[PDB]
Amino acid sequence: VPIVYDIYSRLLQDRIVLLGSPIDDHVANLIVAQLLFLESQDPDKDIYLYINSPGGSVTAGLAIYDTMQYIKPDVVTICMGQAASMGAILLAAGAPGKRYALPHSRIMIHQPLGGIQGQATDIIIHAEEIKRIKEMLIDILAKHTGQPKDKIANDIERDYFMSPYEAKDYGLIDKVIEKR
Amino acid sequence: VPIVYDIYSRLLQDRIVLLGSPIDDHVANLIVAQLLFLESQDPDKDIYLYINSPGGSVTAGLAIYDTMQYIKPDVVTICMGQAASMGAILLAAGAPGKRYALPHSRIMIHQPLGGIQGQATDIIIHAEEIKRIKEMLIDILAKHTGQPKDKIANDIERDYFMSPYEAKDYGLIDKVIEK
Amino acid sequence: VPIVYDIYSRLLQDRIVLLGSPIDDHVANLIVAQLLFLESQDPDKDIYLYINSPGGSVTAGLAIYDTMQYIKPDVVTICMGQAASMGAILLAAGAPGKRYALPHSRIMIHQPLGGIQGQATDIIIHAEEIKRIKEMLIDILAKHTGQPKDKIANDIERDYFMSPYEAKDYGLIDKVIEK
Amino acid sequence: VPIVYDIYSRLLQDRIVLLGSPIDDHVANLIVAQLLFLESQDPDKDIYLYINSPGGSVTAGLAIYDTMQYIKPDVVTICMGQAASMGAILLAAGAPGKRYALPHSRIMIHQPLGGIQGQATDIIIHAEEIKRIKEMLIDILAKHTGQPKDKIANDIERDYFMSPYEAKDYGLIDKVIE
Amino acid sequence: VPIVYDIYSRLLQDRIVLLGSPIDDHVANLIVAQLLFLESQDPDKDIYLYINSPGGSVTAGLAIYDTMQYIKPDVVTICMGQAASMGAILLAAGAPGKRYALPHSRIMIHQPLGGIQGQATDIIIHAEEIKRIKEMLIDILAKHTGQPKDKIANDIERDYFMSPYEAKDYGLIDKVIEK
Amino acid sequence: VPIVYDIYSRLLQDRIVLLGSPIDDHVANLIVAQLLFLESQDPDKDIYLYINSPGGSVTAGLAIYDTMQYIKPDVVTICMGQAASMGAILLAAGAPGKRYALPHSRIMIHQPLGGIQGQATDIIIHAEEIKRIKEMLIDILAKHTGQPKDKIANDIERDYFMSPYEAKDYGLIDKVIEK
Amino acid sequence: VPIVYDIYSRLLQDRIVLLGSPIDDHVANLIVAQLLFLESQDPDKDIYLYINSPGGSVTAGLAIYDTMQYIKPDVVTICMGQAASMGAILLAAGAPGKRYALPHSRIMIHQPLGGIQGQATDIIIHAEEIKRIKEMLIDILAKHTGQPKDKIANDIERDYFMSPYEAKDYGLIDKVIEK
Amino acid sequence: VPIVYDIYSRLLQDRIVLLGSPIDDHVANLIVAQLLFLESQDPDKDIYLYINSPGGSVTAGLAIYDTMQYIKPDVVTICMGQAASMGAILLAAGAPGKRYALPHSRIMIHQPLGGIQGQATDIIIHAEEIKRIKEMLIDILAKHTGQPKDKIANDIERDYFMSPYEAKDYGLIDKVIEK
Amino acid sequence: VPIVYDIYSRLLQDRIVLLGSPIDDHVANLIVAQLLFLESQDPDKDIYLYINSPGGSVTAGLAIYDTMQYIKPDVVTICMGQAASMGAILLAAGAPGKRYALPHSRIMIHQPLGGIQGQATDIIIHAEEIKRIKEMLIDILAKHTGQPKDKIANDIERDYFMSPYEAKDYGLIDKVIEK
């Protein structure tokens, strides 16, 4: 990790945040901390969240999602490499009109996965909870894309891969950017 | 395994079957084979099924259960050591009036357990199937015990351990035998 | 494995074959050998194939399937415990009118699964192959059930669990037998 | 394994041999032993070789191949489930006109695979040997199928899967049994 | 890692970036961060990207590729040791006329690799995706080399190794540099 | 292992011995026992030694070699699949004029391999022993092929693979047999 | 790693670089970064590269080799402990007249090693690539030693160990230094 | 590692170097770096090398050995705990008259150990190399002890343990120090 | 490790050294470094060595022991928790009249342990060395305690555990710290 301030700390001074890993509680804490820090520095200036993530923990993802919606600054989202699963939800959740993808990035949406062991009663309790979480993710995708809930629900049953041009047509991003 | 015929083959001549292990497909296949064999040897004479089992696979247990009900012979059940989970269901599934427990044996009933990984759609499908299998086990226990389904349903939510005299009172066996 | 002749061989004299494990090449060879043997003993007398299997290898399952169709004897199928995946296909593949399930067994049909690693060219070749295998399994289920291909195709996309009475309505079995 | 004689020993009396596993040296010795035994019992009567194999060792497969060609009895081959890689070569190597597939079996041919670690000199020696083995397998397929060598060579570059009716058209079997 | 500023940070002052590892998401983030930092220091001055990489993740590689194309500064690419797979794409993607290789380096291009397990439907979906990715990599190579798409497609079916002089003839680099 | 006598015992009655595995002490003892048994049955009648072996332990191989030379009966050698390393030595060691290869078999000769760890003194002692063993294997090959020792020595420095016809020319076999 | 600057960073001030480990991509990057840094500090002053290495990756080694030939400063090479394999190539690659070995060091040259698994077509492509790499290493050794290519080729077939005085006679170093 | 400068860095100011671990390439590089640093700070003043080592890699040990002889400063050696194998060679290699052991330390000399797997040709090449290395270690011990090479050669065949007073009589140290 | 200087570095300013771990070569280097550092700061002022150790390597322990006797400063030893095996020897090796234990600490002395594998000759050589080491530890304990050698030898044959009061009466410490 090179020095100038480490390279990431230096980019943080330009209000750039990198989400460049699978999303777990550790990564969510780091992303939330940076968004809260940048809001306290200047609540009016745009934040630039670069996304290269295959996704990860739904609850960790929703910690970042609710923080992005709650803070005053607009969060600009930029997809490089890929925004898949929870990564795709965070890309789509950027400020309206300020959601970007680079031209050879890919976006993928799909339903959540789970694991549950134990008594039938407990399996049914956890099946109910994953159902509630799935409906929530459908609701979030519908709100940010403008797609009807029944189209989102049908499309995420299996892995749904999109080029940046397909993601733009879907409403997951506003623009494909090639050159500054 | 001692010889006379190995000891189990010798007891099979007196129409005695030993269910003395956890229930998997291998054990189910062997118990089913012995029941079908004894029926073909004599469809009229009682079979004696000794049960010492903590249970195991539900589908393996229900292969044995349906075979016990399907064959012509009455299947006498005898609990020694324990009949728990699926073992208790097989003990309760003996011919009416011919379900026995030795005095220091224990009987335990409980709801089934499971494990499912994958997409939410698949988890929900497998949760529906475990619900259907649980209802089936409640139906079987109600039928053989004379208890209502709603009482069985409430009683199997947690491990329900019984002495032989409590299992007799519950309707899981007909007699505690001492001598 | 008790002695009388081991228990399985003694039942083989009555033309009883047990498929009571996951299906791999080893199991298919054993089932095929018993089917070929019973045909050579008497080409005209029914064979009784008891099925308790979660399925397994598609090609191993189709070795059994084709042998069941090819030999002269009718193959009576009886589901005990479960007939899932390839097990369900073999249950459905019994002689018309002689496909049975015990009342607490479960039947499940679903699309084939696979694993492939390597170059994009090889992944596409193997994708084409699993597509061909899937279409063949839909055709086999359509033939034996009398269901239309598009209904089978829709139903097997996810795990499709049935009670014996639902399996009878679907056309996978002809009769639910209690006694 | 059931007792009647175990079931395989009983079917061996009817000149039935089951190749129902991946092919290694152990399996090749068992098949060769069964072929030599059946020849000594009766050099005139057909042998029935049922094949359900994903393949395995080339040299083990060629021990079975050469034994099939060498003995006096015709070896009838029957594909059930699958005949892939060396299994497909053994299927195609049955007595002309007596190579059969059950209708839901599958047949697959492909070039051989290898592994070699060590000095450049040794790697080059083993590459020359896999090249020689590959040309030999092409020659065997050409001989038994009647396909030109350059068509075989092109087709086995990648996994080449066939239904029984496609295998019959290719010349790997004579009849799909209905 | 020696100190003057660590050695890499000191070379970063001279607008030198080292890509000297397999490409995963962690490496891509570090390279992109260096490219965005250097652009913000001076959007008009060349960046020098040294490449010694066997490749790695296609999506991680394309994060770097797209960032290289997006920023204002020309990115000079220098191959040392090797540029294989995605390393060869990043080498070929340097500013026109400013793509270099040292004389004993090697360059290799090949089609992408994948791994997929599960239901036929999911295998087919992932086969479609790797096909799309393969066609995109062919398009990128054709663009930066000036080779027709059909020649690239033919050449990447198997590992295509080149000397620096063959790589220049192919259009992957502009000059072999010695001194 | 099928029954008639197991299949191998039945072939042993026709004086057929199968060497179809790597050569270790266990395999060597089995082959020697079969050779000693057949000699005691009839010291005048040929033995048929089928060889499909990648080789193995030099001392285990030389136990077989010396037994083949020592017994009264001619040992006919037949290569099927492969005779590599010690397998090729045993093939070459058959009675003169009675060494055969099937037409798609392969023969391979190479120098011995070893492992030694410990004090320099012990390493040098074991290096000397491996030198002595290698010289002995070159002498055996020269004796049975009629090749000069310096040609054998040059040829076995690396893996030397041969078709049956190359092996005939070399003097490792007498005839390639098709029917 | 003691502090003064850590000890290595303090020696880097005197233009001393330590290659004291097996050569991988990580090590190549660190050596290249030090060579480029020292060139930018002063393009005219000698660099001192101490080599204690058993070797490692050929491509990692050739990244260092090409960097050593490309930079303006003469690279003085000093062998301590050993320079084996790619280590020996880097020792020989120092500025003419400025290649040194300490008197109890050892130098070893040998041909490259590789590993390839997969289809025959892929094995042959990689066998061709390792042939090209071996011929390139022979070319580099011939250039820096003045030995004929055929003598190098013969000598590197097996591990070729040299004392410092033998390495000087071979043309791999210019001087053995004691005090 | 306590701070004042960590404790080792603080003692390095008083020209004290600690060799207190097994000797591998990493340790060799750290000791060589400290010796080269202290020479550049003051080429005339004594260096104090404390040795507590069971030894380790011969080539790593010889990198330190040759550096100790090559630099201008005298290297005082002090044995604490033990100086065994390569540790004993480095102890004996100190400046004449300036080799010390503490009174409860132990010194042990022995021949080198090795390990080689592969072809007979490779084993013989590596037996020759271990012989050459052993002769070189004998020459070094003979030079610093004043013992004849043949006496050293006989004494190192097995583990030769010495008290400090025995080591002094042998010529491995000059003085046993107490207070 | 808290900061003020880390906490250990801050106590080192008060000439406090903590031996709070099993004794290996790494721990000995650190303890020796701290003792040599404190001696160079002030050769006249006491050093306070706190000991909480179950012991460990004999040669590592004897490096600390000899350093404790060799330096000019008195080393005050304080037992806290335990001083077992080599820890007890170091506790007893403190400056006469300045060896302390806290009142709920424990002191244990025992003979050394060893592991040796290989040829009988090597086992006998290492058995002789272990005998010599044991005699040396007996001689060190007799010196510091004033006990006769034959009493020490008898007492250390098995684990000999002592309260601080028993250790004082034994002569291993001078004073139990109490209020």
Ligand SMILES: *C(=O)[C@@H](C(C)C)[C@@H](O)C(=O)N[C@H](C(=O)N[C@H](C(=O)O)[C@@H](C)CC)C(C)C
């Ligand atoms: C995309 O990011 C998905 C996977 C990483 C591919 C992600 O959305 C997902 O499903 N994650 C799973 C998850 O967090 N599941 C939770 C759980 O932790 O149990 C369920 C409650 C969500 C319904 C991971 C893979 C467990």
Ligand SMILES: *C(=O)[C@@H](C(C)C)[C@@H](O)C(=O)N[C@H](C(=O)N[C@H](C(=O)O)[C@@H](C)CC)C(C)C
């Ligand atoms: C008693 O026998 C129960 C346990 C063994 C204690 C038994 O009835 C049970 O729940 N077994 C479980 C089982 O068979 N579960 C299956 C499954 O996960 O496949 C469910 C479908 C049953 C509803 C365990 C898994 C053996």
Ligand SMILES: *C(=O)[C@@H](C(C)C)[C@@H](O)C(=O)N[C@H](C(=O)N[C@H](C(=O)O)[C@@H](C)CC)C(C)C
């Ligand atoms: C039911 O029996 C399925 C089991 C649940 C696995 C079975 O039909 C199945 O899909 N089996 C898979 C299989 O045989 N796949 C083959 C194969 O990979 O060889 C594909 C070619 C089938 C199209 C097992 C689980 C791999």
Ligand SMILES: *C(=O)[C@@H](C(C)C)[C@@H](O)C(=O)N[C@H](C(=O)N[C@H](C(=O)O)[C@@H](C)CC)C(C)C
């Ligand atoms: C079909 O049977 C192939 C299978 C995928 C194994 C088979 O023909 C194959 O290539 N087998 C491979 C093999 O035997 N390779 C040998 C060997 O390395 O000994 C080569 C020399 C053949 C060119 C192995 C068993 C995968």
Ligand SMILES: *C(=O)[C@@H](C(C)C)[C@@H](O)C(=O)N[C@H](C(=O)N[C@H](C(=O)O)[C@@H](C)CC)C(C)C
């Ligand atoms: C070169 O860099 C190739 C490999 C490293 C040899 C690279 O192009 C490649 O194929 N990488 C592979 C990859 O990223 N595959 C993904 C995947 O399977 O997830 C494709 C789906 C990309 C769309 C892996 C890293 C071998």
Ligand SMILES: *C(=O)[C@@H](C(C)C)[C@@H](O)C(=O)N[C@H](C(=O)N[C@H](C(=O)O)[C@@H](C)CC)C(C)C
């Ligand atoms: C052929 O059979 C060789 C095989 C590749 C193993 C064989 O001749 C060989 O070298 N075998 C090796 C062997 O027995 N080596 C002995 C030994 O170490 O005991 C040497 C002492 C004989 C020179 C096996 C692979 C170790």
Ligand SMILES: *C(=O)[C@@H](C(C)C)[C@@H](O)C(=O)N[C@H](C(=O)N[C@H](C(=O)O)[C@@H](C)CC)C(C)C
């Ligand atoms: C000396 O440095 C050699 C060995 C490390 C002793 C070295 O030159 C060598 O052969 N390295 C091998 C190597 O890099 N092989 C590559 C590769 O596999 O990528 C071949 C292509 C070399 C032509 C290592 C040991 C794999």
Ligand SMILES: *C(=O)[C@@H](C(C)C)[C@@H](O)C(=O)N[C@H](C(=O)N[C@H](C(=O)O)[C@@H](C)CC)C(C)C
């Ligand atoms: C003492 O230090 C010896 C051993 C560590 C006990 C040491 O001298 C020794 O023999 N080391 C050995 C070694 O370095 N061997 C090399 C090697 O195998 O490469 C030989 C070539 C040296 C003749 C090993 C590390 C124990």
Ligand SMILES: *C(=O)[C@@H](C(C)C)[C@@H](O)C(=O)N[C@H](C(=O)N[C@H](C(=O)O)[C@@H](C)CC)C(C)C
């Ligand atoms: C107390 O400190 C003893 C053990 C830790 C309990 C200690 O004195 C001891 O015996 N340590 C042993 C040891 O160092 N043995 C050496 C050795 O093998 O190097 C012998 C040479 C000493 C006779 C080890 C730590 C068990």
